[PDB]
Amino acid sequence: PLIVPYNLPLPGGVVPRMLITILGTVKPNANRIALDFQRGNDVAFHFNPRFNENNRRVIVCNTKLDNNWGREERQSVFPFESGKPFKIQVLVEPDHFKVAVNDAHLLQYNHRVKKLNEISKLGISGDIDLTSASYTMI
Ligand SMILES: OC[C@H]1O[C@@H](O[C@H]2[C@H](O)[C@@H](O)[C@H](O)O[C@@H]2CO)[C@H](O)[C@@H](O)[C@H]1O
């Protein structure tokens, strides 16, 4: 496995047709997972499954610019389960990140950060055993 938090370099940032795949297993009694696609200190795309926010499971997505969080986009469809292996695929499309979990479409997140080729790191954190993190051009 990989050590969490884990940093995956994205050389020359991202670009449409780039597919990023994260394989892991959620720990028992998990509280959170986070993917942070960063442009330097900014977070272009924060993808944050929360297992207990007011006794609901929710996915919170956002962007952080100059250390300020923007408007959250929330998704109540929640495909993760404590204890279970997962696959998160993030496909960069021209206008949005497209996220599928376990081969089922989950959400899209429109690009707020425009300099895609400067989004050069993915941080992976939270209550998971991380198996692999990689990318491919499709
Ligand atoms: O927006 C993503 C960001 O959220 C922070 O938590 C928010 C919270 O979601 C919101 O309901 C409350 O009113 O303000 C909190 C602080 O901005 C998280 O702390 C952060 O890690 C991100 O997940």
Q: How far is the CA of 103 from the centre of ligand 1 (A)?
A: 28
**SS3 of 116, please?**
helix
Residues 6+ apart with CB under 8 A from 55: none
User: What residues form the annotated binding site?
Assistant: 69-75
Q: What is 1-138's CATH number, 3.40.50.1970, 1.20.1530.20, 2.60.120.200, 3.30.230.80?
A: 2.60.120.200
Residue 20, strand partner residues: 90, 135
Instruction: State the sign of the Cα–Cα–Cα–Cα dihedral 90, 96, 100, 101.
Output: positive
Cα 14 to Cα 137: distance, rounded to the nearest angstrom = 10
Per the listing, tokens 């989004």 go with 119
Method used to determine the 3D structure:
X-ray
**SS3 of 87, please?**
strand
| Domain residue extents for the chain | 1-138
Q: How far is the CA of 48 from the centre of ligand 1 (A)?
A: 10
